[PDB]
């Protein structure tokens, strides 16, 4: 069964918003065939498997997501199922060639410590960088709020990609910090055989 795009999050205007593009009745048939003729748009895709939903971000012409979500699955497309270009189980990283219409985010180079996490609801949460792959939430949020948001981007104030949200540093149901795949790790993945 293929991963299916069910929505999108637009990050290029003055407003971050989500738009749902697929219901439940179509997801299952689209998953079995891997054929989805719906048009793609935006930097972030809301994707689903059998019973789980998460995010996928376009960076350097690749649509990236978490392995813990996608596994080795193909993604549904107008021509049929698309096989992964990249997979790093140790990094929890998967990638397919970006679909037509998906705009890629720019990798951040200003080395900002002030970061913004993008949720599946297109809510933008401020994060302070605490290392290469860690950031603390300025306002701690319960774990329940962050569920279904892995694969989404960490952005700098200029709106460039800093990382991909992978895990939360949880203490008694509260997420105090977030673990992310740095954008320099994605660049290493695209360069190595
Ligand atoms: C294949 O490799 C891997 C697979 N899986 C990994 O992590 C899994 C998935 C990830 C998760 O739930 N993702 C979220 C998520 O939203 N997932 S999802 O979209 O719901 C998914 C089910 C579709 C963003 C979370 C959200 F819940 F907050 N995990 C945690 O957030 C855990 N915290 C944790 O481990 O924090 C550290 C790292 C500090 C110990 C808690 C305790 C919350 C379960 C556990 C890998 C992590 C790393 Cl670093 C490297 C490789 C990994
Ligand atoms: Zn930047």
Q: Of 138, 121, 122, nearest to 176 (Cα)?
A: 138
Q: Do domains 1-105 and 106-193 have the same CATH topology?
A: yes
What is the Cα–Cα distance from 100 to 103, expressed in whole angstroms?
A: 8
What is the Cα–Cα distance from 10 to 102, expressed in whole angstroms?
A: 10
Residue 11 CA to ligand 2 centre (angstroms)? 14
What is the Cα–Cα distance from 161 to 183, expressed in whole angstroms?
A: 7
Tokens of 81: 């199922």
Task: Give the pairing of strands 161-171 and 174-182.
Answer: antiparallel
CA angle 168–93–117, rounded 5-degree value: 40
For the chain, the straight-line distance linking the first and the last C-alpha, in angstroms and rounded, comes to 26
Residue nearest to atom 12 of ligand 1 (CA): 167
Tokens of 115: 């970061």
Q: Which residues are identified as catalytic? A: 68, 92, 148, 150
CATH for 1-105 (2.40.50.1020, 1.10.8.60, 2.40.10.120, 3.40.50.1950): 2.40.10.120
Residue 155 CA to ligand 2 centre (angstroms)? 7
What is the Cα–Cα distance from 183 to 35, expressed in whole angstroms?
A: 30
Resolution, angstroms, 1 dp? 2.0
What is the Cα–Cα distance from 147 to 112, expressed in whole angstroms?
A: 26
Which experimental technique did the depositors report for determining this structure?
A: X-ray
What lies within 8 Å, CB to CB, of 87 at 6+ separation is 67, 72, 93, 94, 95
Which residue(s) pair with 63 in the sheet?
58, 96
Residue to substitute in 68, 131, 180 for testing ligand 1 pocket (most ligand atoms within 8 angstroms of CB): 68
Write out residues with Cβ below 6 Å of ligand 1. Answer: 52, 54, 67-69, 89, 92, 143, 146-150, 165-170, 175, 179
Which residue(s) pair with 55 in the sheet?
46
Longest dimension (CA), the chain: 46
Fold for domain 106-193? Thrombin, subunit H (2.40.10)
Which residue(s) pair with 33 in the sheet?
none
Q: Where are the domains of the chain?
A: 1-105, 106-193
Place of tokens 């698309």: 82
């Amino acid at each position: 069964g293929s991963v299916v795009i069910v929505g999108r999050i637009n990050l290029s205007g003055d407003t971050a918003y989500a738009q749902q593009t697929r219901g439940e009745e179509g997801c299952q048939e689209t998953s079995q065939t891997g054929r989805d003729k719906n048009q793609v748009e935006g930097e972030v895709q809301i994707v689903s498997t059998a019973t789980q939903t998460f995010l996928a971000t376009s960076i350097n012409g690749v649509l990236w997501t978490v392995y813990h979500g996608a596994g080795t699955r193909t993604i549904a497309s107008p021509k049929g199922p698309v096989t992964q270009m990249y997979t790093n189980v140790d990094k929890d990283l998967v990638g397919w060639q970006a679909p037509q219409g998906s705009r890629s985010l720019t990798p951040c180079t200003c080395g900002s410590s002030d970061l913004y996490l993008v949720t599946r609801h297109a809510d933008v949460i401020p994060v302070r960088r605490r290392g290469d792959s860690r950031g603390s939430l300025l306002s701690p949020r319960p774990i329940s709020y962050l569920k279904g948001s892995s694969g989404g981007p960490l952005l700098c104030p200029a709106g460039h990609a800093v990382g991909i949200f992978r895990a939360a540093v949880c203490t008694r149901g509260v997420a105090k910090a977030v673990d992310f795949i740095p954008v320099e790790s994605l660049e290493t993945t695209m360069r190595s055989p």
